[PDB]
Design a protein around this ligand. Structure first.
Ligand SMILES: [Mg+2]
Length: 520
RNA sequence: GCCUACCC
RNA sequence: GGUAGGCUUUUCAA
């Protein structure tokens, strides 16, 4: 009996013909929220991946899980555990339509806590289209009227329109009625324009006009000094400036001052190139100190993935799609690579013995989140995270055989990246870890395997490998399968309480692994 | 092959 | 359509 055969009825065949279990729908929801379905997986095409995921979603609703889904969606977004928003917003959209009315009413109810910025809403509304009314009109209206005039003003000027949707269309389609003078002004500004509003017009309301005026002013003035001035006075950001100003060193030195974190993160390369982040500079020193402030990273909801993508591209001196070059600053590379570990919800060590196994087979070459990072690299990063928290941990890599582990606990993130480079390839034997462990008489209480569960060699089933391990070593060893995709497969036996299914790249992954290690 | 802003 | 920034995919002051 090997992986080519089913252990029991419950099991189903992979994408390779070998047998595994089907991840619980709830768990697949999490996989989906974190990885989405762009580019699909190594075996499943993008389109069918989304279809497989859409099916599981509806299945949950069918089964009553309607409100648990929204609650989970609501929680992942607020806690910022998912790199990108599309999957969450698409999920909240499907729920916003499902048969259940409990779920639907819960979906629109959570819209303002999930759609924090215009883009989020625009993407939500567009999804509803790919799939107005009382609920919709109400939800959109509440999004604006519950805000503070002065805040809405920034929101609507920072994000005038995204993906084909403007606040002008939303305001009109929802037939909103400004809850106060401040909001009517902003609304009039949006639908009718500055002139109309300027022509039509409290201390609080004046503040709102002032601002709107500022935003209009920084687009007519030729004087750079005045631009810089307004930026200082009204905290105007990049989106507020005419793109011709974005070539001025002094504009950015003024823009960097209190630049939001994602903005700062996505423009590290450009600022270095324009000498705004010159070597040894105060500015650079400032940047590093901000990127490594866990609280602000947390406040700005900087996901570790975004850090990884920026680090990879930043040290490359040049972009992937971009077309500018810069001498990568070593202080920044050390600050980003440091920030990576602070972006995850950190936890107190348990002290247990962990065996961390990275699936490095050919399939792990598959690209994640439509980025330039592959599952191999991401799995290794997640691995480094768990290894720097629980010191008693031995890392190992595998494909269809045990391979010398290319990385170490003391390596900087970009060294672990290129090392996974030279080694990703081969077939998949997901039982090797447990098997290796027994053979080297290596003790462990927890096994964490970072895989896509597409095991395919004629060797015993990983679940079988774990049992043989328990019996042989006399340890109740548990097994945590950290998923690297949104496929619906798992080498984890649902009937074994010592086997858990978690998602890779959930900034909250650390807490789940802990709760499980500690029998919670 | 894509995102924005400005003019038209 | 013309022009200009950027692509670390859409820039979460939070
Ligand atoms: Mg493989």
């Amino acid at each position: 009996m090997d992986q080519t055969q089913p252990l029991n009825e419950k099991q189903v065949p992979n994408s390779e013909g070998c047998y595994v279990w089907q991840v619980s729908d709830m768990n697949r929801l999490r996989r989906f929220l974190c990885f989405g379905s762009e580019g699909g997986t190594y075996y499943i095409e993008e389109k069918k991946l989304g279809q497989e995921n859409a099916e599981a979603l509806l299945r949950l609703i069918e089964d009553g899980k309607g409100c648990e889904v929204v609650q989970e969606i609501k929680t992942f977004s607020q806690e910022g555990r998912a790199a990108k928003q599309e999957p969450t917003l698409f999920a909240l959209a499907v729920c916003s339509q499902c048969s259940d009315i409990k779920t639907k009413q819960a979906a629109f109810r959570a819209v303002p806590e999930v759609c924090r910025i215009p883009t989020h809403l625009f993407t939500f509304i567009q999804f509803k289209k790919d799939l107005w009314g009382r609920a919709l009109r109400k939800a959109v209206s509440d999004w604006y009227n519950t805000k503070d005039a002065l805040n809405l003003a920034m929101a609507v000027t920072k994000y005038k329109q995204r993906n084909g949707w403007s606040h002008k269309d939303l305001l009109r389609l929802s037939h909103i009625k400004p809850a106060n003078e401040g909001l009517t002004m902003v609304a009039k500004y949006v639908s009718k324009g500055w002139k109309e509003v300027q022509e039509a017009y409290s201390p609080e309301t004046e503040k709102v006009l002032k601002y709107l005026e500022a935003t209009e002013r920084v687009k007519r003035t030729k004087d750079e000094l005045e631009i810089i001035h307004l930026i200082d006075e009204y905290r105007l950001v990049r989106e507020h400036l005419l793109t011709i100003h974005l070539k001025s060193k002094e504009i950015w030195k003024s823009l960097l001052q209190d630049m939001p974190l994602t903005a700062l993160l996505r423009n590290l390369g450009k600022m270095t190139a324009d000498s705004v982040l010159a070597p040894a500079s105060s500015e650079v020193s400032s940047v590093c100190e901000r990127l490594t402030n866990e609280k602000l990273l947390k406040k700005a909801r900087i996901h570790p993935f975004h850090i990884l993508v920026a680090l990879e591209t930043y040290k490359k001196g040049h972009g992937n799609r971009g077309k500018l070059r810069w001498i990568p600053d070593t202080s920044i590379v050390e600050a980003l690579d440091n920030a990576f570990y602070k972006s995850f919800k950190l936890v107190e060590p348990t002290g247990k013995r962990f065996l961390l196994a990275i699936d490095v087979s050919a399939s792990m070459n598959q690209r994640v989140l439509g980025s330039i990072l592959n599952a191999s690299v991401v799995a290794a990063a997640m691995c480094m995270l768990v290894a720097r928290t629980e010191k008693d941990s031995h890392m190992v890599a595998f494909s269809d055989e045990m391979l010398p582990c290319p990385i170490t606990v003391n390596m900087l993130l970009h060294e672990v990246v290129e090392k996974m480079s030279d080694i990703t390839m081969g077939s998949t034997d997901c039982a090797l870890p447990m098997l290796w462990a027994q053979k080297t008489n290596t003790a462990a209480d927890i096994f964490i395997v970072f895989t896509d569960c597409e095991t395919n060699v004629e060797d015993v089933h990983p679940a079988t490998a774990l049992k043989q391990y328990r019996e042989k070593m006399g340890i109740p060893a548990k097994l945590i399968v950290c998923a690297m995709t949104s496929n619906g497969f798992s080498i984890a036996d649902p009937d074994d309480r010592g086997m858990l299914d978690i998602c890779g790249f959930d900034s909250g992954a650390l807490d789940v692994i802990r709760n499980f290690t500690l029998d919670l």
